[PDB]
Amino acid sequence: MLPISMSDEGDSFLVKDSLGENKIPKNPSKVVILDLGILDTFDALKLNDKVVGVPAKNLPKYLQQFKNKPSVGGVQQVDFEAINALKPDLIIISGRQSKFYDKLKEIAPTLFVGLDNANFLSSFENNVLSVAKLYGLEKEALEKISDIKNEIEKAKSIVDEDKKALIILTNSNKISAFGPQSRFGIIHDVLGINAVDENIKVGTHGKSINSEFILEKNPDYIFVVDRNVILGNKERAQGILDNALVAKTKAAQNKKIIYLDPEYWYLASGNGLESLKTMILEIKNAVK
Ligand SMILES: [Fe+3]
Numbered sequence: 637m638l639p640i641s642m643s644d645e646g647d648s649f650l651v652k653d654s655l656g657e658n659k660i661p662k663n664p665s666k667v668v669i670l671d672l673g674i675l676d677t678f679d680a681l682k683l684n685d686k687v688v689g690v691p692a693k694n695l696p697k698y699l700q701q702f703k704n705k706p707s708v709g710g711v712q713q714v715d716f717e718a719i720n721a722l723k724p725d726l727i728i729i730s731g732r733q734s735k736f737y738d739k740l741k742e743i744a745p746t747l748f749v750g751l752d753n754a755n756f757l758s759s760f761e762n763n764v765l766s767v768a769k770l771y772g773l774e775k776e777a778l779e780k781i782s783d784i785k786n787e788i789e790k791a792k793s794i795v796d797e798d799k800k801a802l803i804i805l806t807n808s809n810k811i812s813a814f815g816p817q818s819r820f821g822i823i824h825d826v827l828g829i830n831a832v833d834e835n836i837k838v839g840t841h842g843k844s845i846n847s848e849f850i851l852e853k854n855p856d857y858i859f860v861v862d863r864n865v866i867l868g869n870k871e872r873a874q875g876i877l878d879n880a881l882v883a884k885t886k887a888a889q890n891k892k893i894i895y896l897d898p899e900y901w902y903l904a905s906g907n908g909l910e911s912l913k914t915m916i917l918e919i920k921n922a923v924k
Contacts, residue, residue: 637752637759640766649770651747655737658745663771664726668708668719671730673907674749675699677764680780680909681773688722694866696899698911711903719743728767730907731840751906753821753839760784763907780909787913791827791920799923800832801857802850802887805842805902806864806873812842813849820901823859827919847881857923858887859894861901894922 641652648661668689669675676699678687684701691714692707706722709715711732719727720743727746729737740746749767752759761781768777803814803823815836816824824831832855836843850858862873877893887893896918905911 637750637755639758639762640747640749642766642769651745651766653748654750655734655746655748656741658741658747660745660747660770661725666722666724666726668722668724668727668744670708670711670714670733671728671749671907672696672699672711672903673751673905673911674728674730674763674767675702676905676908676911677767681768681771681776683771683773686771688724689719694903696903696905698899698905698914714740716740716743726770730904749907751904753819753825754817756822756826756906760906760912764909777909784909784913784916787916787920788826791916794920794924795828796856796923797828797830799856800830801859802832802853802855803859803861804845804850804873805861806871806876807867808864808869808871809876811845811847811850811876813845814838814842818842819904820859820861822906822915823919827916829857829919829923847877847879850877851881851885854885854887856886856890857892857894858882858885859896859919859922861896861898863898863902865898866902892922 638654642649648659651658651660665686666688667686669687670691687705689708690702690705691710693710708718714736724744727740727744729748731750749763764777768774803820805812813836814820815831818838819840823829832853860873864871882888900911900915
């Protein structure tokens with residue numbers, strides 16, 4: 637995962653990222669943001685007035701200050717006609733919109749703020765700082781990055797190293813597991829919670845598993861991300877895991893099956909100076 641690089645050209649920056657190269661004007665004034673975390677970072681840096689389009693169909697509870705903005709669809713259902721009609725000077729995307737990069741780059745300079753699951757903290761810093769640098773706000777960004785570092789250390793200091801967690805996602809009645817360096821990796825990689833099974837190694841899709849696997853591993857914590865909440869489906873993780881095999885795990889018996897808010901974890905708000913902070917606190921409060 638290539639870090640974002642910028643070179644000053646007076647009125648504009650020459651910007652290189654994993655997907656390509658763009659000329660980005662300084663102080664862009666009409667920004668379409670498809671990544672929810674970076675939307676939150678815009679709010680944290682007081683750049684709300686620079687934003688002209690957001691994915692209103694997936695706008696979570698903590699980003700309701702952007703409901704007034706023009707909708708450019710959802711994080712997957714990108715509305716190209718809407719984006720084009722706004723005439724933006726900058727489009728910002730993450731992993732979900734990489735597939736749309738060439739069409740978006742025909743409308744305006746398109747900055748990629750991907751989170752590298754193998755290098756979460758560095759990519760996050762580089763994403764926040766590269767946005768800040770467009771506006772001259774490096775100093776504000778560093779103070780907020782330093783707040784996140786502080787929250788990380790508060791979380792870490794409370795972790796019980798004798799305990800092991802499993803991370804699962806639920807989608808319809810299907811359960812998939814995720815481990816270190818996956819899309820939920822920060823629970824293991826940044827907050828230092830031990831994985832039950834270090835050998836689950838996956839990215840965005842996950843290992844297909846069942847309630848017998850979960851009992852076999854017998855984790856002390858189960859972190860559940862229920863994709864059914866995002867997709868509107870009738871099935872609920874709470875129903876999926878209410879069975880006799882899961883009931884016998886240390887997790888069920890100690891009431892440490894923890895239902896993480898998928899508006900943060902699944903929508904992947906990790907680029908947010910305030911949303912990352914809330915996710916770190918959600919982990920910390922679930923295990924302390
Ligand atoms: Fe998805």
